[PDB]
Structure 1
Amino acid sequence: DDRELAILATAENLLEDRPLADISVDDLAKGAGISRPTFYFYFPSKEAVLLTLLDRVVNQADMALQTLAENPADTDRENMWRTGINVFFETFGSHKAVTRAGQAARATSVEVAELWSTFMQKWIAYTAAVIDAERDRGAAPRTLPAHELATALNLMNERTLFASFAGEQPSVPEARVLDTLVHIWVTSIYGEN
């Protein structure tokens, strides 16, 4: 456990500086102060190490969103959506290396693709349930199917946050991405059509 956490911290450090393809099991064992065979006790592969790093970051974001859902919802509609989107901005934004490599690996790894898909379904279904509540209370108009709207807005957040964090071209500057997403969620949820 000592040593497991030591391997994980070494992988997150090395991913800040190069891809997983460029990090060797030997690099990971060296950093964690264990032998290579001792590494293979804790993790079947460097790929299994990334999968565990991603699982921790995804669960941290999920647990923060549940925390927010526990307490009452803000009496200001725009602020209620900003606070929830900010959970993802801060959590993944605090773990950009893990995030970047995580997204790369989804094309590679069925396990990584499956983890990402399970969490996105959970977050889309929660988004859809809040839009349905807003429509029930008379605050939001009955336009698009709620689940479809929730799907597109969640995919937009995924691609846009990732582009900002990786500093891709094109991308919204990190300092502008929360305002930009909140504007699009609010106008599309409350907007008549």
Structure 2
Amino acid sequence: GDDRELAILATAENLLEDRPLADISVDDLAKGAGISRPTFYFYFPSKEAVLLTLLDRVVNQADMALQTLAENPADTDRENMWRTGINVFFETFGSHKAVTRAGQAARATSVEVAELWSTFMQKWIAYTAAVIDAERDRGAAPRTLPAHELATALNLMNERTLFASFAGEQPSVPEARVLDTLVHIWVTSIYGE
């Protein structure tokens, strides 16, 4: 049943908080989920497919929250609008730091994980660019850089900066400061002449 599959995923996420995926065996996942190794292979072909599934759930959680925001504009200024949107990624991925860090490392080694991340980044960049274009059309932002190129760089900044903060990398922006830092750069670069 789905319960055994969910047990595997819950075990994987918890074990990923203490060691990398290269330090997790299929027997570890089976044992923590209360199943045998052959039973595990009925639900997943590999431990990498387990991570892929975990990462897919996290990215779709962030995507669905962003869609929710897009359909219900909040009644605030332009700065808070961008902050509320960037915060979706801050909170969703910040609530799944182990899966986030694991998925970032797997991008090099897994074509499926690299394609998953690329597909969602393309979608989020396209939406960012559409909002910038709307702001220009209504006269609220100046026509400076091509909107899509600007949106690409800003989203890549968020990816790199958020993930450095969550991993505690050196250098990084402190996690308590990263939202204000990113919002400042987005707002000045989108609305500055």
TM, length-normalised to structure 2: 0.99
**What's the CA shift string for 1:131-173, capped at 9, x where partnerless?**
0000000000000000000000000000000000000000000
Q: 1:170 aligns to what SS in structure 2?
A: coil
Return the alpha-carbon distance in structure 2 between the equivalents of residues 30 and 103 of structure 1.
26
Q: What is the rounded CA distance, in whole Å, between the counterparts of 2:116 and 2:192 in structure 1?
A: 33
CA distance in 2, matches of 1:3, 1:34: 8
Alignment of 1:1-80 (within 5 A): 1-80=2-81
CA-to-partner distance for each residue in 1:24-75, whole Å, 9 max, x for gaps?
Answer: 0000000000000000000000000000000000000000000000012544
CA distance in 1, matches of 2:115, 2:3: 28
- Pairwise CA distance, 1:79: 0.2
Residue 9 of structure 1 and its aligned partner are, at CA, apart by 0.2
Q: After the TM superposition, which of the residue ranges 67-76 and 122-131 deviates more from structure 2?
A: 67-76
| Residue equivalent to 2:192 | 191
TM score, norm. by length of structure 1: 0.99
C-alpha separation between the residues in 2 aligned to 1:71 and 1:90? 18
- Residues 92/78 of structure 1: CA separation in 2 closer, same or farther (3 Å cut): same
Give the match's secondary structure for 1:143: coil
Counterparts of 2:37 and 2:9, CA distance in 1: 15
User: How far does the alpha carbon of each residue in 1:157-190 deviate from its partner, in whole angstroms, 9 at most, with x for none?
Assistant: 0000000000000000000000000000000000
Secondary structure at 1:177 match in 2: helix
Moved more, 138-147 or 68-77: 68-77
Residue in 1 aligned with 2:137?
136
Structure 2: distance between partners of 1:79 and 1:30:
46
Q: Which range moves more in the overlay, 179-188 or 65-74?
A: 65-74
1:77-119 Cα shifts (integer Å, max 9, x gaps): 0000000000000000000000000000000000000000000
| Alignment CA distance shift 1:133-1:158 (3 Å) | same
Task: Tell me the percent identity.
Answer: 100
* CA distance 1:68–1:148, change in 2 (3 Å): same
2:111 aligns with: 110
Corresponding position of 2:91: 90
Structure 2 CA distance for aligned equivalents of residues 50 and 81 of structure 1: 30
Q: Secondary structure at the match of 2:139?
A: coil
Q: Distance in 1 between matches of 2:192 and 2:107?
A: 34
**How many residue pairs get matched?**
192
Q: Secondary structure, in 3 states, of the residue corresponding to 2:79?
A: helix
User: Once superposed, which parts of structure 1, at least 4 consecutive aligned residues long, lie more than 4 Å away?
Assistant: none
Q: 2:74 & 2:121 partners in 1: Cα distance?
A: 21
